[PDB]
Structures are given as structure tokens and as C-alpha cells.
Design a protein around this nucleic acid. Structure first.
Length: 1156
RNA sequence: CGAUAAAGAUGAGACGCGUUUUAGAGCUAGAAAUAGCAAGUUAAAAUAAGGCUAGUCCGUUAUCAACUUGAAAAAGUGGCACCGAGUCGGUGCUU
DNA sequence: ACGTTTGTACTCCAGCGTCTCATCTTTATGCG
DNA sequence: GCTGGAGTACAAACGT
């Protein structure tokens, strides 16, 4: 039979609601066959339901932890590099110093050499920690020593600098001597003249505000160049020097960039060295502004100013510490034990030994400082956030690597005379500090990664010193862009040409001009310009004028070439749109119309623009054009190198001039140039009986021939969770087609709360798959897209109200009403929703009458009867059995919580490495269970060695999962299970459904906790009343309708008692939370004499006691009911396990009572 | 109709902090128990266990009823009406 | 008839800030 | 924040 039906969907980020209706808008009911060892053999089910699943996560967290893993690996490799550089000498001075460093984490019994990590004795360790209290004291000492020092001290200082090196944001060497901001500004004005500045520059005001403030209070007269260089200093960026200093072109000589030197040279040619002193002062002032807050110390007594500043911070911590100690011992003696001994408060002891930040300690110690006297400067430092500070602090992220490199340079230039190996390896260690893999090279994989693009020039290990001789950086950055840009849509095998290609612009000119038509003198035939005439017009106007030519210019060229027949032109605009811009720039730079005109040099120019579009670091551009420097002078070689092109086109070169029909041999560009008086455009050759259009379809089919369902949802443009929803929606559609005897649905209706267009296309592609004799796709299944507004409109107009707090039936009810509205309006119209209200209002206040049976105007149709349609959809909405399935999913993600908890005697701690005993070291805690397994075996119970046979539910950790799947039997025997039964092991993922007495259901949250599994089928009257009462002040309708709703909600005030009675009955049947229910009834009893709106707004809040899923806390009326957790899955082992299909219609029920 | 801007997705390269264990000798009184006093700012190592394909890679995204085949991918498996409704029941027909 | 284990109820806890660069869609806004 | 793990105190129920 035909068995006509339709399928409705509601795709969500967290759920997929589905419904099947017939031609009479009825849900069909069908009896299904179940499997398993249970006694039930057939179950009657209704063809409406929803599928719930966890939200799809983005890849960002995985990306960040992957990047962190790479960073830790690289830092460990730097430590190994420096431990191979110092290796031979360190074997002589103190062998196993590196080994004492590596075993520092272990407890003293687990150590192999000595507990003291540096010198191996107690006296020298104490002397080191007293002579150099922090690492910065040793850093300052080794920077300024002039004496020989122990090699361990040099290693510790330089290793601390390499391990914590700083940011690479400031490009260019930063001299630490420039520190006076006021002198920098006055020197800028003075050098300009020859050719509170400190407070204003170092103020925390914005760079825009800072420049504006200095410009407002500007003593310099006729000194706009001083103001521009001041912008280039404080802001770090000058404006266009064509107006700032009368340069030839717009020159933005912004500092802190590698292009600063090249733009400065361009300005020196463009201005004529009339701003060099300004640029020089700007650089000095930019430095002194940048290092101002970083190095808050005078810079005339040391070469390591960061060490001096941190020593000053340590010293002020000590001074204000002893003074605060004295003042609390002298004025508030009842608080010294709390501030300086208690590690649980936010005092000093919590700030150092506990877990208090600087903010928390400041907030705690401020009121103590206020009430006591003598605390003036301590308070002043606290507002300046400079009281009792530490060196390793949150604000150390602004220290540039130039400072650490300067200190490291100072030790390798102060200790190189005594230790000779430092002198030849100085640049090696400096490279180890400063080497940073570029963003266009990526992971240095040998081919064993799915994220790598790097190409190797050699086959050797990539050390930080052979990176430029082993990694082909050109091909690396080429592959970096070439994996990211999309392939050709027509030919999905090969890549895509740059947007600024000469071939593409020539194609656009010739395609527009081929679409353009001329007009003859007598016949006035459109046709087109001839191919020779086309090239002549291009060279006359489009190759002459950089901007597009006007129709007047085209007419002037037509009359200029030969005597015009008629300058009128058909199929053309007032001005053209295609421009020969890149050829014009090459004619303005290369300045010869020979290489840019000869077709033998076309591939050269295409590679030129490939380089300009591809690379943006300008050294890469430098080398790739240096390959081609033999055909041009050096000046244009360093001028065109500074040209950057942005953008990628949507067409490829094989589509444009690579595909040629075997009958003709002409390219698509050649066909556009000369079509034999046919004037066919690109879309003409792409959609005709020519051989070009056939090969495109054959390649679009042959290549990407798989194009799997998960692939095509995966390669879309949207959030991952909505892609999960779309994929589950498609699977639901397939199974719903299967359920009805594999007959196709007549319509499919879609609603999501461009991606809608795409999911419509997927469903249309899978359902509509039949072509006629003339190869025309017959639309057997009309996939319909619907906005969400219409559904809510009817929901409110026909009072088909939803409270989402009752149950998850509202999802499938949205799906059913979706497939009611959509297929009604596809019939009534083949206000638009005014065909619905029978008493439709008018501008005169008249309730214009409507027919009971609505119909289409043009032809007779049963679109909507205002009787027996209410009854059907009311029945389906009040229908108690609708199939909600929570998607059983194996958990993936982190093994446990990321917090490293301290040591305990508990066994729940997890070994953070292989041999780290957690009772000594501590470690991770609370692991994540991948899935639970039901194991029937016998355990060792009792002191008398008794094998008590037991059935238990054991949770498998994500970490344990691979070891369990390698050998389940051996894993169980290692766990403590003797003589297990291999064939009764059942894999139970999260949200596995179990059925118990009185229809009670529980979902498996884990091996030791369950979730509520039942749904309260509260009738339509109660949910309609609850929406009317809670939206009492937000009715948003006509005043008569609002008054009628108010009268209706006042007349049924007794419905609250019926609602709470339904809640109590359903909670007593399946929820089984006696104390929570008693507190609920006490709270409802206490709060009866309150208005109905608030009462129903909190009866809505009540319904999360009975909601599907995890137990949750809630508040009714100023009282919080804490969650009743089911923390024992012992009842589940005697229950009935239900396996369900994605729709849930097809079931497999296992009686676990019979297993064992 | 080019063009700009915002948001989102994906990928790469870098810092700063935090946590853990250990190292920085606590002293004095007291038989001890516990007090009085001193002091504190730093470093090493690890930062998903680990894996083989041994890379200055990979390891937390996406995918996932049961059943029968398939290496996997993937394919295959469950009769239809009608009257009723508290998580679906009943009746008839036919396999 | 002690003893040990499983059921309850209750409380607490959960890795986080920044910067540079690149490539795609998808919305949006004034032009006119 | 969610919601699952874990610790703690206290008693009921099952083992021997």
C-alpha cells in the first residue's frame, strides 16, 4: 500500500524531538516486538518521541591542552639541551647535580643521592639560602660579580631564565638603560628642535588618552613632528607620514614590529631624513615607557634591573613585615596568632603558607591597618598594591625576554673568562632562550600527526640551531596556508589560485566583456565585441586605467579604435566592475610593459602574486622573490617585496584555463575571449551540453565520492552541538522510515531554535533520490523548513501551553505541533495566521466570522476544521505514553579532576606517575567512569577464606578502559574477582535504563549513583493553568482576552491542590524522596495565603523534584530543598535492563534477576 | 552592488600564575603534654597514567541500543487494522 | 550476639589569567 | 554552575 504519512522534527542543541502524523493529523499507534529473556513479547507504542543527549563540546579545550603538552615537552627539551651543554664540565665540578635536580620531587627515602638538591650538604645549602635569599639575588650577583663563581650557581641562574623567559611580543632589541620617561620626552622635543612628562607617560591612562593628554599640554610650538613621534613612542605607532612629515606615500612606521626598519627606510627615502631623529627619540621613549613599570628601579648601578627591582620588593616585604609584626604585637595583641600563625585565614600566614592571594590578604589586613596607628605608609603601599609582595607573582607576565636575555648575556660575558666553554657556547644558550618555532611551521612531526604541515629539507633531528637548515620554511608556510584554504568546488582534488591572480582578473574582464554586447549601425545586433576587438578594447581602456572604465570611456575607445558603428552597448553597465589592478601595480612597480605583457612570463607573474598573497612575514616574500630577482633590478626587487595582497578566490586555474573540451580545445577563458559569435559566459559554459560541464560533474561525483553522512554534517559551518542534533535527527528520520514498512513520508517539517537550509538539503538529498526518464528529481518527500514563531503563536492562540519544568514531553509535543502547523499552512496558502481565529478581529472592533471548515481559495481543500482538530491534537498532547530516550553514551574526556590534592592515607588517590605512591606524594582524586560492567563472580569474603558468590556493578575508569578492553578477565582477577563468568559481562554506559517495581525507572549515572528515570504525565488542564497563572502580568494580548484569562485563572484557584496532589502521588510512586516531599508539603502549607501568580511561579519551580535526570536542589518560597541522591546501585542489579533504539520503539529487555 | 565591522568555528606558536612532593637546620622552657618566641617572599620536578609509529610527535573534539554478518567501513533483523488510555492495554485478521 | 557492611543524611569541592598569527562562514550596517 | 566523587557521623540490616 501507499501508506501516506509525514514526519515532524524539532532539532535542538540538547534534544531531537520527532513525531509521525497521518493525513488526518493523528499520531499512529503500533505494536512492536521486543527481544530478550523477559516475559513481555509485544508492546503497544505511539509514534511520537524525543531523543535527549549531552551537548557536543568544542575542540578548544582539547586544542589548549594539546598546546600546553607541547609547551611542557619543549621546556623539558630546553632543560635537556642545557644539561647536555653543561654536561662534561658538570661531571667534573659536581656529578649527579643534575640527578639531584631530577629526584627533587621524591621523598627522602625515595631519593638516590641526597635530600639537599644543590650542594649535597647542609651547611652550603644554608649558606646559599642566606647569601642569596631568592633566585634574583643570585641573578644580580652573577650579572655583577667580576669574580669566579661555582658552576652550579651559573646553571641555576641561567636555567631559571630559560625556563621562565617571558613574552616575545616586543620585536627589536630593548635597551635597559633607557628608563627616564621625562628625559625621553624632553629629549624628543630637543632633538626635533635641533633638527609632568614622566607622570603623563607612565600613567595607566590609555595610549590614545596619553597621546591626547600630551597633545593638549604641549609646550612645543609648530612641533607637529614632535607630536607624531610622541605618538610613535607612547602609542608605538605614528600616523601616515605623507601627512605627518610629508612623505611620498602613507607610511605607518609603527614600532615593536619587524617591518619597522623597512617602513623607516621607506620614510627615509620618502621624507628625506627629516624625521630620523624623531624616529630615534620615538624608539628611545617607547622603550623608556615600556620598561618603566617593569623596571621600577634606577638603572645606573646594575645591568640586571629586574633582579634589582625584585630584590627591592623582597627588602620592602621584610621591612614592612617586621614593622607590621611590631605594630600588631604593640597595639592589637589579640590578633598576632590569627595573622601570623593561622593558615586558614586571609592573614599573612594564609598569604604565604595557605592559599590566599595578594587581593585576599590586602582585603583582610586593610581593616587591621586602619584601626591601628602608625600604619600610614603601609596603607599607602596597600592602595599602591606594593605591600608585602612576592617576586613570583601574577603580574610577571609583562617582563619581556629582552630583559632575561640581557641578564643571561651579562653572566655569559662576566664568567666566560673563568669558564672557557661558555665563550664558544654563548650564542648556543642565547639561541635556546630566544628560539621560538614560528606560527607558520607548527608541529615538527615526521608525518605521525594530524595537525602537522611541516616539510623537511633533510632527514635529521630539528634542534634549535639547525631549524633553518632542516625545515624548508618556504614549503612549510606554503603547506600552512595550503591545508587551510579550501579546494575547488568543481574539482575537489586540487587547490585554488590566489584572488589577486592575473588569470582571474583577465577572466573577470573577458567574462564581463563577453557578457557585454556591442550595437551595430544598421542592424543594431547585440552579439559581442570580436575577440581581437575584445583584446583591443582591454588594452585600450581596461589595461590603461587603474579604476574601471565608464561606458563613456568604452564609447570613446570604440570610436578611437575605428569609426564606430553605434557606441551604444547592450548587456553592459554604466561602468565595468572587473579591473586589471594587479597588472597595473606591476606596471607601476616593475615599470616595463614587456614581462607584464608577454604570455611567456604569465606563470612568473602568477607565482609573484602567489608569493604576495601567501606570505606575510616579508622574509619569506624576500626569499621567494629573490629566486626571481634575475629578471628585474634590485630597486623593484625591494619595492615589490613590500606589496602585500589579501584574499583567496573561489575558482581554480584548471577550471579557467586547464579544462578544454576535446571537440574544440579552447579553454573557458579562451571561449570567453572568442566564442565564434556566441558570447557565452562562464555560467553558460558550466551549464550547457558542452564537454566542459560534463567533466565538472564527473569530477564533483568521482572525487569526494564517499561523502559520508557524519562527514557532511561534520564539515558544516556551525556550533558542534547543533551538528550533533542534526546527525541524530537524520538517524531518527531513517529509523522512522524503517518503522512504517519503509514507505517514504509525504512531508518532513524542520524547526531549529542557513544551517536550517543546510539540514533541509541533507534530508532532501537522502529522501528525494529518484530521477525521471529525463533525469529530473521527483520530489516525493517535501522537506519543509519552518520558523519557530508560528508554533509559539498557535501554542498561545489555541492555548496549547507548555511548562518545560513538568517533563520532557514538551519536546516531542513541539515536534508534533511543528508537523501540524507546517502541513496545515502548506494546504491553506499554497496577518497570515488570521485564518486560525474564528472570531478574527477587525479595525472596527468587529469579530469577523470565519467558516468552521476552512478551505483554500483557489481550489477545494480540507485545510482546517475548527471542530475535531482540537480534539485530536488535545488528545495527542494529553497522551501519556511518548518515547523519550536519553542517549546512552560512553564517557570521554579527562581521567579525573585536575586538582593535585595533598597526601592522604586514603586509597582513592591516584598515582600521578608510575612509581609515585600516593600515600607519600598525593595526586589526583575522583576519577571519571567511562562505563560500568556487571560482573558475576565470587569474592574473598570473611576471615575464614569463604568464596561468597556475588553480583556487583564495577565502574571502568577512562584510564582503565584500554587495559580492561585488552583483557577483561585478567583485569577482573587483578581487581579481586576470582573465577569470573566471561559471557555474563554486560557493558553499561551512562544513562543505561533499568525498570523496577510499579514502573519505576532509573538511569545509570555511574557505578555508584543513579538518576531519576520517570516522567510525570500531568494533564493538559494543569499545564495550561500553570502557564496562564505564571504569565499573569505578561499576558501580551488584547484587554478582553487578558480579562478573560484573569477570570479563568481566578475561577480555578483549586487547581493548585490538584497539582500538588499529582506531584505527591508521582513522587511517592517513583521518586521515593520522603523527607524532600514532606518539606515540600510543609512549604506549600505555610504559603497558601499568597497571590496565585507567585504561587504558580514556584509550583513551576517545584517540578524539578520529579524531573528526568540527575537530582537537583530547588527553592520554593525562601526555603531550599536539597537534592535526594540515589547513591547505591544495588536495586538495579535485580531490575530489568532495557536496551532501546534511537527512537526507542525497538526494544531489548533483559531480566537481570535471571542472570547469576 | 562592491566594502568594512562584529560574533563564531578550526589550527599553530608563547608567557604568567596555581597545585603537589621535596630542599631552605627552627629556638627556648617543659619529663612529656603543650606553651612562649623566631621565621615566612625562593628553587627543582610533574602538570592528564602514558603510547609506538620514538617525532623538540600522539594522548581530554567529533562517533557509540541489542541482535546477525563484515577486518573495518558497512549492510541486514522486528506483520496489519480497529476500540480504548496513567507510562500503553484489548480485540479481530494473517503470518 | 558481636562485627561488618550497607543505607541514610549532610557538607564540600571542582585549573585559571594574558598575548601573537592564520584560514573559513554567518549577520549586520550604511551606500544609493 | 552542574552533578558526580569523597569524607564523616550514625544506625539498620545482614553474616557467622
Amino acid at each position: 500500500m501507499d501508506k501516506k504519512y509525514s514526519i515532524g522534527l524539532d532539532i535542538g542543541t540538547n534534544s531531537v524531538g520527532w513525531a509521525v502524523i497521518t493525513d488526518e493529523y493523528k499520531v499512529p499507534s503500533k505494536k512492536f516486538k521486543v527481544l530478550g529473556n523477559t516475559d513481555r513479547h509485544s508492546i503497544k507504542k505511539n509514534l511520537i518521541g524525543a531523543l535527549l543527549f549531552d551537548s557536543g563540546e568544542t575542540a578548544e579545550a582539547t586544542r589548549l591542552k594539546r598546546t600546553a603538552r607541547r609547551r611542557y615537552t619543549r621546556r623539558k627539551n630546553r632543560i635537556c639541551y642545557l644539561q647536555e651543554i653543561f654536561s662534561n664540565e658538570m661531571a667534573k665540578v659536581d656529578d649527579s647535580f643534575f640527578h639531584r635536580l631530577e629526584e627533587s620531587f621524591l621523598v627522602e627515602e625515595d631519593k638516590k643521592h641526597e635530600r639537599h638538591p644543590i650542594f649535597g650538604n647542609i651547611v652550603d645549602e644554608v649558606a646559599y639560602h642566606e647569601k642569596y635569599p631568592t633566585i634574583y639575588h643570585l641573578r644580580k650577583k652573577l650579572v655583577d660579580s667580576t669574580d669566579k663563581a661555582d658552576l652550579r650557581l651559573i646553571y641555576l641562574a641561567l636555567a631559571h631564565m630559560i625556563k621562565f623567559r617571558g613574552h616575545f611580543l616586543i620585536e627589536g632589541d630593548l635597551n635597559p638603560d633607557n628608563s627616564d620617561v621625562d628625559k625621553l620626552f624632553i629629549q624628543l622635543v630637543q632633538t626635533y628642535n635641533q633638527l609632568d612628562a614622566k607622570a603623563i607617560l607612565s600613567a595607566r591612562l590609555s595610549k590614545s588618552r596619553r597621546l591626547e593628554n600630551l597633545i593638549a599640554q604641549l609646550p612645543g610650538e609648530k612641533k607637529n613632528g614632535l607630536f607624531g613621534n610622541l605618538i610613535a613612542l607612547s602609542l608605538g605607532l605614528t600616523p601616515n607620514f605623507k601627512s605627518n612629515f610629508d612623505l611620498a606615500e602613507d607610511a605607518k612606521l609603527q614600532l615593536s614590529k619587524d617591518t619597522y626598519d623597512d617602513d623607516l627606510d621607506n620614510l627615509l627615502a620618502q621624507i628625506g631624513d627629516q624625521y630620523a631623529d624623531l624616529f630615534l627619540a620615538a624608539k628611545n621613549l617607547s622603550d623608556a615607557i615600556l620598561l618603566s613599570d617593569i623596571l621600577r628601579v634606577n638603572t645606573e648601578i646594575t645591568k640586571a634591573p629586574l633582579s634589582a627591582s625584585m630584590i627591592k620588593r623582597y627588602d620592602e616585604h621584610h621591612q614592612d613585615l617586621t614593622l607590621l609584626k611590631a605594630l600588631v604585637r604593640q597595639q592589637l595583641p589579640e590578633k598576632y596568632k590569627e595573622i601570623f600563625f593561622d593558615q586558614s585565614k586571609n592573614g599573612y600566614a594564609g598569604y604565604i603558607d595557605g592559599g590566599a592571594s595578594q587581593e585576599e590578604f590586602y582585603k583582610f589586613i586593610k581593616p587591621i591597618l586602619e584601626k591601628m596607628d602608625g600604619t600610614e605608609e603601609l596603607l599607602v603601599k596597600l592602595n599602591r598594591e606594593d605591600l608585602l609582595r612576592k617576586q613570583r607573582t601574577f603580574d610577571n607576565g609583562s617582563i619581556p625576554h629582552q630583559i632575561h636575555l640581557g641578564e643571561l648575556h651579562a653572566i655569559l660575558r662576566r664568567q666566560e673568562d673563568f669558564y672557557p666553554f661558555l665563550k664558544d657556547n654563548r650564542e648556543k644558550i642565547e639561541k635556546i632562550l630566544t628560539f621560538r618555532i614560528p606560527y607558520y611551521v607548527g608541529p615538527l612531526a615526521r608525518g605521525n600527526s594530524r595537525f602537522a604541515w611541516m616539510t623537511r629539507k633533510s632527514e635529521e633531528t630539528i634542534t634549535p640551531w639547525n631549524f633553518e637548515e632542516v625545515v624548508d620554511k618556504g614549503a612549510s608556510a606554503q603547506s600552512f596556508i595550503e591545508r587551510m584554504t579550501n579546494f575547488d568546488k568543481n574539482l575537489p582534488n586540487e587547490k585554488v589560485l590566489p584572488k589577486h591572480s592575473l588569470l582571474y582578473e583577465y577572466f573577470t574582464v573577458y567574462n564581463e566583456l563577453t557578457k557585454v554586447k556591442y550595437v551595430t549601425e544598421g542592424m543594431r545586433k547585440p552579439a559581442f565585441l570580436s575577440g581581437e576587438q575584445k583584446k583591443a578594447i582591454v588594452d585600450l581602456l581596461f589595461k590603461t586605467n587603474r579604476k574601471v572604465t565608464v561606458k563613456q570611456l568604452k564609447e570613446d575607445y570604440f570610436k578611437k579604435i575605428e569609426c564606430f558603428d553605434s557606441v551604444e552597448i547592450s548587456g553592459v553597465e554604466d561602468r565595468f566592475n572587473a579591473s586589471l589592478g594587479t597588472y597595473h601595480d606591476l606596471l607601476k612597480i616593475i615599470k616595463d610593459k614587456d614581462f607584464l605583457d608577454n604570455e611567456e612570463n604569465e606563470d612568473i607573474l602568477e607565482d609573484i602574486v602567489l608569493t604576495l598573497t601567501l606570505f606575510e612575514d616579508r622574509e619569506m616574500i624576500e626569499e621567494r622573490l629573490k629566486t626571481y630577482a634575475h629578471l628585474f633590478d634590485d630597486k623593484v626587487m625591494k619595492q615589490l617585496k613590500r606589496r602585500r595582497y589579501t584574499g583567496w578566490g573561489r575558482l581554480s586555474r584548471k577550471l579557467i584555463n586547464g579544462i578544454r573540451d576535446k571537440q574544440s580545445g579552447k579553454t573557458i577563458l579562451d571561449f570567453l575571449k572568442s566564442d565564434g559569435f556566441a558570447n557565452r559566459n562562464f555560467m553558460q559554459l558550466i551549464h550547457d551540453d558542452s564537454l566542459t560541464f560534463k567533466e565538472d560533474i564527473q569530477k564533483a561525483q568521482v572525487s569526494g565520492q564517499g561523502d559520508s553522512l557524519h562527514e557532511h554534517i561534520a564539515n558544516l559551518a556551525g556550533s558542534p552541538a547543533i551538528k550533533k542534533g542534526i546527525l541524530q535527527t537524520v538517524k531518527v528520520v531513517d529509523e522512522l522510515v524503517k518503522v512504517m514498512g519503509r514507505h517514504k513520508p509525504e512531508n518532513i517539517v524542520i524547526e531549529m531554535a542557513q544551517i536550517t537550509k543546510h539540514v533541509a538539503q541533507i534530508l532532501d538529498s537522502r529522501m528525494n533520490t529518484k530521477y525521471d526518464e529525463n533525469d529530473k528529481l521527483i520530489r516525493e518527500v517535501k522537506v519543509i523548513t519552518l520558523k519557530s514563531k508560528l508554533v509559539s503563536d498557535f501554542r498561545k492562540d489555541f492555548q496549547f501551553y507548555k511548562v518545560r519544568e513538568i517533563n520532557n514531553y514538551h519536546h516531542a509535543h513541539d515536534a508534533y505541533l511543528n508537523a501540524v502547523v507546517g502541513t496545515a499552512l502548506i494546504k491553506k496558502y499554497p496577518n497570515i495566521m488570521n485564518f486560525f481565529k474564528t472570531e478574527i478581529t477587525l479595525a472596527n472592533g468587529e469579530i469577523r466570522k470565519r467558516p468552521l471548515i476552512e478551505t483554500n481559495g483557489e481550489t477545494g481543500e480540507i485545510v482546517w476544521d475548527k471542530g475535531r482538530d482540537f480534539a485530536t491534537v488535545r488528545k495527542v498532547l494529553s497522551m501519556p505514553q511518548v518515547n523519550i530516550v536519553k542517549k546512552t553514551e560512553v564517557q570521554t574526556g579527562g581521567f579525573s579532576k585536575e586538582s593535585i590534592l595533598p597526601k592522604r592515607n586514603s586509597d582513592k588517590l591516584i598515582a600521578r606517575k608510575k612509581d609515585w605512591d600516593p600515600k607519600k606524594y598525593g595526586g589526583f582524586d575522583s576519577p571519571t567512569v567511562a562505563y560500568s560492567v556487571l560482573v558475576v563472580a565470587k569474592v574473598e569474603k570473611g576471615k575464614s577464606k569463604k568464596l561468597k558468590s556475588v553480583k556487583e556493578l564495577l565502574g571502568i575508569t577512562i584510564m582503565e578502559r584500554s587495559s580492561f578492553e585488552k583483557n577483561p578477565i585478567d583485569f577482573l582477577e587483578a581487581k579481586g574477582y576470582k573465577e569470573v563468568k566471561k559471557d555474563l559481562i554486560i557493558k553499561l554506559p551512562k544513562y543505561s535504563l533499568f525498570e523496577l517495581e510499579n514502573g519505576r525507572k532509573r538511569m545509570l549515572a555511574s557505578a555508584g549513583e543513579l538518576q531519576k528515570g520517570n516522567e510525570l504525565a500531568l494533564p493538559s488542564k494543569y499545564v495550561n493553568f500553570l502557564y496562564l497563572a505564571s504569565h499573569y502580568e505578561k499576558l501580551k494580548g488584547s484587554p478582553e482576552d487578558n480579562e478573560q484569562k484573569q477570570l479563568f485563572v481566578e475561577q480555578h484557584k483549586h487547581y493548585l491542590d490538584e497539582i500538588i496532589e499529582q506531584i505527591s502521588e508521582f513522587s511517592k510512586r517513583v521518586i521515593l524522596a520522603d523527607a524532600n516531599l514532606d518539606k515540600v508539603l510543609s512549604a506549600y502549607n505555610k504559603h497558601r495565603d499568597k497571590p496565585i501568580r507567585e504561587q504558580a511561579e514556584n509550583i513551576i519551580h517545584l517540578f524539578t523534584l520529579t524531573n528526568l535526570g540527575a537530582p537537583a536542589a530547588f527553592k520554593y518560597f525562601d526555603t531550599t530543598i536539597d537534592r535526594k541522591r540515589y547513591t547505591s546501585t544495588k536495586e538495579v542489579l535485580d531490575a530489568t535492563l532495557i536496551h532501546q533504539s534511537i527512537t526507542g520503539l525497538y526494544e531489548t529487555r533483559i531480566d537481570l534477576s535471571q542472570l547469576g
